[PDB]
């Protein structure tokens, strides 16, 4: 089997992407944030504290003939940005782009933090990292991908994110029409539960490639590209008027600036992030100062190849016995 679903930016900055997912019987369609940096599938629901719901579509288990409470199970997660959610757990039938998993853990939010409430466009998350990060207790549950794997034609999914435009998540096959040239595959470590890999270096603009190992995670659920302070300083030094602002919370630059591209290495291959992808627009409405899409990972504890990086590529998440990551230009 295979599945194929379109993913759409939630706003004009590509802050996140939402993908329609069918839950229950008859189907309840919710728009989820597919997150390769976490491993919980959780939804706004009929159980979510009423005051914490503001425009989201909710899952109502009591209207699904295939829903079953996982009695005694609870979940609680915190994300890198400090947001959080928690609740109890159902199993139900979940379909993504035609691909159906029966008995999927669907984690029903009883509580969500302000950032989730405030985002009316996101009905929940679908985690695609490794199931070892799943937060269900007492017994950890498997991700959609994990559950689907034995059914898939090939044990893969692919992320093809759009710049200011829709893209695609495919399960079980590689669409050889969605990229140019070849896919370069690189080793993954699952030790921390992430799609963790090592880039071979970077270049700024038309500068020479610097060969240096950068360990990081492929994370569709993070907006920006977070890299070591040395790397990030080298980039912004090439932008007239750019500086790091503690009050804004990162590198800023004059909105009129022309930004250089940023190249990262995948083995002996290269992925080029165009300058425009690195412009995340005014720091506040009407400002002539703009926020950078490449920021320092210092203080995060991990480098993160988030949407800014991933949308410049066709990305293969290979969940074979020995997992790998593949990157193609497109």
């Amino acid at each position: 089997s295979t599945g194929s679903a379109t993913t759409t930016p939630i706003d004009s900055l590509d802050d996140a992407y939402i993908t329609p997912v069918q839950i229950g019987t008859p189907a309840q369609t919710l728009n989820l944030d597919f997150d390769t940096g976490s491993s919980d599938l959780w939804v706004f629901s009929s159980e979510t504290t009423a005051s914490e719901v503001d425009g989201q579509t909710i899952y109502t288990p009591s209207k699904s003939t295939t829903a079953k409470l996982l009695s005694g199970a609870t979940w609680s997660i915190s994300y890198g940005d400090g947001s959080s959610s928690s609740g109890d757990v159902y199993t139900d039938t979940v379909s993504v782009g035609g691909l159906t998993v029966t008995g999927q853990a669907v984690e029903s939010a009883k509580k969500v933090s302000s950032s989730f409430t405030e985002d009316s466009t996101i009905d929940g998350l679908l985690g695609l990292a490794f199931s070892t990060l799943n937060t269900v207790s007492p017994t950890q549950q498997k991700t959609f991908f994990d559950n689907a794997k034995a059914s898939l034609d090939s044990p893969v999914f692919t992320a093809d994110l759009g710049y200011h435009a829709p893209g695609t998540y495919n399960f079980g096959f590689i669409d050889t029409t969605a990229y140019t040239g070849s896919i370069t595959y690189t080793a993954v470590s699952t030790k921390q539960g992430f799609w963790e890999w090592t880039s071979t270096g970077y270049a700024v603009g038309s500068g020479t490639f610097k060969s240096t190992s950068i360990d990081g995670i492929a994370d569709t659920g993070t907006t920006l590209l977070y890299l070591p302070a040395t790397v990030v300083s080298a980039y912004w030094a090439q932008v007239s008027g750019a500086k790091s602002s503690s009050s804004v919370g990162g590198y800023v630059f004059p909105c009129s600036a022309t930004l250089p591209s940023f190249t990262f290495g995948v083995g002996s291959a290269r992925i080029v992030i165009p300058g425009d992808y690195i412009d995340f627009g005014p720091i506040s409405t009407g400002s002539s100062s703009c926020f950078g899409g490449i920021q320092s990972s210092a203080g995060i504890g991990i480098n993160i190849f988030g949407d800014v990086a991933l949308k410049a590529a066709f990305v293969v998440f290979n969940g074979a016995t020995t997992p790998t990551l593949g990157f193609a230009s497109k």
Side-chain angles (χ1 to χ4, degrees), residues 23 30 32 41-45 48 57-59 75 106-109 112 123-125:
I23 306 173
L30 274 68
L32 306 186
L41 194 178
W42 74 259
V43 296
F44 281 77
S45 75
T48 310
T57 295
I58 60 167
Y59 166 61
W75 63 279
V106 177
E107 301 171 34
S108 167
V112 306
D123 302 326
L125 266 68

Side-chain angles (χ1 to χ4, degrees), residues 267-287:
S268 67
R270 306 292 180 253
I271 299 293
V272 180
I273 302 169
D276 288 351
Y277 290 23
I278 296 163
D279 176 8
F280 267 74
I283 60 171
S284 295
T285 309
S287 185

